[PDB]
Each structure stands twice: as structure tokens, then as C-alpha cells.
Amino acid sequence: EEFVPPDENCPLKEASSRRIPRLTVKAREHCLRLLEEALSSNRQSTRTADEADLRAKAVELEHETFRNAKVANLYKASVLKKVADIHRASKD
Amino acid sequence: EFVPPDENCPLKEASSRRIPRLTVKAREHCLRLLEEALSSNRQSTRTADEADLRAKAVELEHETFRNAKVANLYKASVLKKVADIHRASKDGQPYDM
């Protein structure tokens, strides 16, 4: 009902605006929360998607090392080298 | 004898016996080494600049606020954007701003 000023923590833009009648600061903050909750779920979803992509890339990298190797030790060394190449790109 | 891949094995040519003395679990370990290396590379070079969630919501809320004149229509519009975001999510797509 009654409009009360925003508190110190209010993150809203135009927080003090009373341009929309009967719309409280806290009602706007509740809407902000609904949006935050949705975006948080969206982020979790895209992270799950990124992991699946990362897994697919790893499978591909491992398979190419497997297919190019004939003996177990050289396979391993080839894997360690590719890991080294990834760490390098990580700096650059 | 050769130990078969289990039902969760992520490898291509998982059951291939071509490399002697190379177990499926050894290949999976190597896959995990590569995966961790990639995950770090990816999380560093390309994911450390994701926007703050509250900052995103502030702009979405304000965009709704400034385009509305009446409280109930402001609220319906907020719920519409919430629904839009959910839809992006079920499709595993990011809501970037």
C-alpha cells in the first residue's frame, strides 16, 4: 500500500521513483528476485550445457590420441603432451 | 583378460583392444586429465567475465519498470520475462545482456 523510501541495500535503478502508483519499492524488489531466481536457473542450465560440451571435446581429444598410438606408454606420453599443450594455451 | 567398458564409459571405440596392456579405465583416466586441463583453460580464458546475476536482474527489472505506467502491467511484464528466461533454460541457451 504505502510507499516507503528504499533502504541502503536497494539495488534498483530509479529506486525512489513513485511514477507507478501503488507500486512499492519492495514490490519492485520482489520482481527483481523473481528475475534473479530465473537467471540463476538459466546459468545453472548453461553451465550443465558447457560441461557436456567440455566432455565431448575431451572424448574427442582422447580418441585422437588413442587412434594415433599403438603402445600403451606412447599413448600415455602423447596424452601428457596434449595436457601440456592445453596448460600452455591457458597462459596464452 | 580384457576388462570391458562399463555402462557409463564415455570413450569412442571404448571396447577396442588394439593397444595391448591399455585398460579402458586407463583411457578414462586420460580422458579426465584432458577434461580437467580443458575445464581450467575454458574456465579461465572464457568464463571469468560472466555478469553478476543481480546486476543482470537490475537491468531487466528497470527495463520493465521504465516501459510500464501501471503496477499490474509492470508485474505481468516481469512474469513474461521470467517465462522467456525459463524458455531459454529448457533449451539450454544463455540469457545474455
Angstrom distance (rounded) from CA B94 to CA A45: 8
Angstrom distance (rounded) from CA A89 to CA A85: 6
Best of B78, B86, B90, B93 to disrupt the A interface (most A CBs within 10 Å) is: B78
Which structural domain range is residue A71 located in?
A: 52-92
Among B12, B29, B50, which residue terminates a domain?
B50
**Phi and psi dihedrals of B84, rounded to 5?**
-60, -45
**A64 & A88 share domain:** yes
Angle, helices B71-90/B53-66, rounded to nearest 10 degrees: 140
Q: Are the C-beta atoms of A12 and A6 separated by less than 8 Å?
A: yes
**A44 & A65 share domain:** no
Resolution of this entry, Å: 1.9
Q: Which residues in A lie closer than 8 A to residue B11 (C-beta atoms)?
A: 59, 62-63, 66
B4-13 CB contacts, 8 Å cutoff, 24+ apart: B10/A55, B10/A59, B11/A59, B11/A62, B11/A63, B11/A66, B12/A59, B12/A60, B12/A62, B12/A63, B12/A66, B13/A63, B13/A66, B13/A67
| Angle, alpha carbons A86-A55-A90 (nearest 5°) | 20
Report residue A29 as a C-alpha cell.
Answer: 524488489
**B15 & B29 share domain:** yes
Q: Which residue in B has a C-alpha nearest to residue A19's C-alpha?
A: B69
Question: According to the entry, how was the structure determined?
Answer: X-ray
Angstrom distance (rounded) from CA A89 to CA B23: 29
**Total domains, chain B:** 2
Handedness of CA A79, A81, A87, A90 (dihedral sign): negative
Query: At which residue does the C-alpha cell 512499492 appear?
Result: A24
Q: Which residues contact residue A2 at a Cβ distance below 8 angstroms, ignoring those fewer than 6 apart? A: A24
**A40 & A29 share domain:** yes
Judged by CB atoms closer than 8 Å, whether chains meet at B85 and A38 is answered as yes
Q: Which residue in A has a C-alpha nearest to residue B88's C-alpha?
A: A42
Count of C-beta atoms within a 10 Å radius of residue B8:
6
- Quick one: how far is CA A1 from the chain centroid? 38
**A45 & A7 share domain:** yes
The CATH number linked to B69 is 6.10.250.3140
**A71 & A40 share domain:** no
Which SS3 state, helix, strand or coil, does residue A1 take? Answer: coil
Angstrom distance (rounded) from CA B89 to CA A84: 35
**B63 & B36 share domain:** no
**A85 & A46 share domain:** no
**A2 & A42 share domain:** yes
Alpha helix ranges (H) inside B1-97: 24-45, 53-66, 71-90
Angstrom distance (rounded) from CA A86 to CA B43: 12
**A22 & A61 share domain:** no
Q: Are the C-beta atoms of A92 and B45 separated by less than 8 Å?
A: no
Angstrom distance (rounded) from CA B82 to CA A35: 6
Report residue A77 as a C-alpha cell.
Answer: 606420453
The CATH number linked to A37 is 6.10.250.2460
String of DSSP letters for A26-47: HHHHHHHHHHHHHHHHHHHHHH
**B79 & B45 share domain:** no
**A43 & A73 share domain:** no
